[PDB]
Amino acid sequence: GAMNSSNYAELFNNDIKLFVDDTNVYRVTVHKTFEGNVATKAINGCIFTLNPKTGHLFLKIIHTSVWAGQKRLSQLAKWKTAEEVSALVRSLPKEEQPKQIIVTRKAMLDPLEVHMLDFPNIAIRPTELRLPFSAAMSIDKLSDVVMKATEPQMVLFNIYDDWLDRISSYTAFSRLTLLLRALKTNEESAKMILLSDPTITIKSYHLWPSFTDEQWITIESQMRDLILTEYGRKYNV
């Protein structure tokens, strides 16, 4: 059944699982036509497929050519997502295939279930959590590789950098969701926080700055302030 606050720790057990977020698969800019009508122009997207235990991110880049000549693109996007997730699973050795796939939006359930009929023992699950994975395109290196792609492409990342050398998965996932929740509520402030001290750098093979343990506590603190605030700035409290 559904994944929620009550069974949260199952994410960090030793059963292979993947979150799949489709919120950035089909992306458009809306604009005016010379005739003064409105039209959309698609831009490159991505499927965000994440192992929450190991941090491995399978970033399938969805190139705008996928949409050429297609109708009902928002519906196709869910089926294209499920097709690419199914292809990824089939590509993995049996002992690496997930035992569960958790979709962040319930509209992915039937598309994924149908594409995974060949895998009756992989559980397809929704979640009651409001996870902030739409903000993954606020991570500069992820956004960059998506926008630069000229063809379909899979790029592999560890979204936890080297954190697991020092902290547990649970803690690493909590840091990740706080960072992304911040970036989603106010991207400018979020990003200001992360790059204020120029002495702290992002290694070439990482996504986030090389904070010391003590600097992470400060950073984490500042992100919670932002979220509380923006929640005030938004609701006036």
Partner: protein, 300 residues
């Protein structure tokens, strides 16, 4: 016009014959039903006064033998029985019609309801859904489960309806996942019609039999089967024009006949709203949509 005589009526019971029903008191002098129209299947069904639990009954075709109903005090039900002695059946029956101890199948001559509900229902197909081959007639009751229900326990007592499952490899061609799930025409026309049922008549016959078991026995798995077979047609973009026209007639008469007070459990809101208002065939069921809107507009 044929006859299903009764040995007796030792327990108080509501007896149905097709869409008609009458109350028989305990030990009332009742010895059966006469003037049954030849050429159609029929169902004779029972609800005891003392236990409205378990409606049960028998599908039969008088052309296939001489049948009588005898109460069994051990198993506690009215049993259908086939008499092989045609003279002894005749001898027993002549006594009953002379003493006027039979009710008459009360067919109004203008009325085509039963024909329209059983148009495609054959006894030979019923007997493959209900497996009990030593008898020419078929028992059904409220509790019997379907093969598909048993998948998700006693198989001898099952309803072997054709398994329909929209999220199944049978339903979904590899590489046409989205196409086959959103437009079920290949599952309808190739898998089911051309492959399993062979023609639309057999498909409609199973659809009609499932509805009738749902209506007369409140058989839940039958109601599931009826709705699934409707939904498979409505969710297909490509349906032969003769099938859609006949489907509209079939469903019109089913909805017309349904008890006004049973629509709450026997009609699945989602299937009907999808079929009448969203599906490919939303525009192809004019008579059915009219009677649904004028009779069950709440459901919609």
């Amino acid at each position: 016009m044929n006859t299903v005589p009764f040995t007796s009526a030792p327990i108080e019971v509501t007896i149905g014959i097709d869409q008609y029903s009458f109350n028989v008191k305990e030990n009332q002098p009742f010895h059966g039903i006469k003037d049954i129209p030849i050429g159609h299947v029929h169902v004779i069904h029972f609800q005891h006064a003392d236990n409205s639990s378990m409606r049960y009954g028998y599908w039969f075709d008088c052309r296939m033998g001489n049948f009588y109903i005898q109460y069994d005090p051990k198993d506690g039900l009215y049993k259908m029985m086939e008499e092989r002695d045609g003279a002894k059946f005749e001898n027993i029956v002549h006594n009953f019609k002379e003493r006027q101890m039979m009710v008459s199948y009360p067919k109004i001559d203008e009325d085509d309801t039963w024909y329209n509900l059983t148009e495609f229902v054959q006894m030979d197909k019923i007997r493959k859904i209900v497996r009990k081959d030593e008898n020419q007639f078929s028992y059904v009751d409220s509790s019997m489960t379907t093969v598909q229900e048993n998948e998700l326990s006693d198989p001898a007592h099952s309803l072997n309806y054709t398994v329909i499952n929209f999220k199944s490899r049978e339903a979904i061609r590899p590489g046409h996942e989205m196409e086959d799930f959103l437009d079920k025409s290949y599952y309808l026309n190739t898998v089911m019609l051309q492959g399993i049922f062979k023609n639309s008549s057999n498909y409609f016959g199973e659809l009609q039999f499932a509805f009738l078991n749902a209506m007369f026995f409140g058989n839940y798995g039958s109601s599931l089967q009826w709705h699934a077979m409707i939904e498979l047609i409505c969710s297909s973009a490509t349906v032969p024009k003769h099938m859609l026209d006949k489907l509209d007639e079939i469903l019109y008469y089913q909805i017309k006949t349904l008890p006004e007070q049973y629509s709450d459990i026997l009609l699945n809101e989602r299937v009907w709203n999808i079929c009448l208002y969203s599906s490919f065939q939303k525009n192809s069921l004019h008579n059915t949509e009219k009677i649904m809107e004028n009779k069950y507009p709440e459901l919609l």
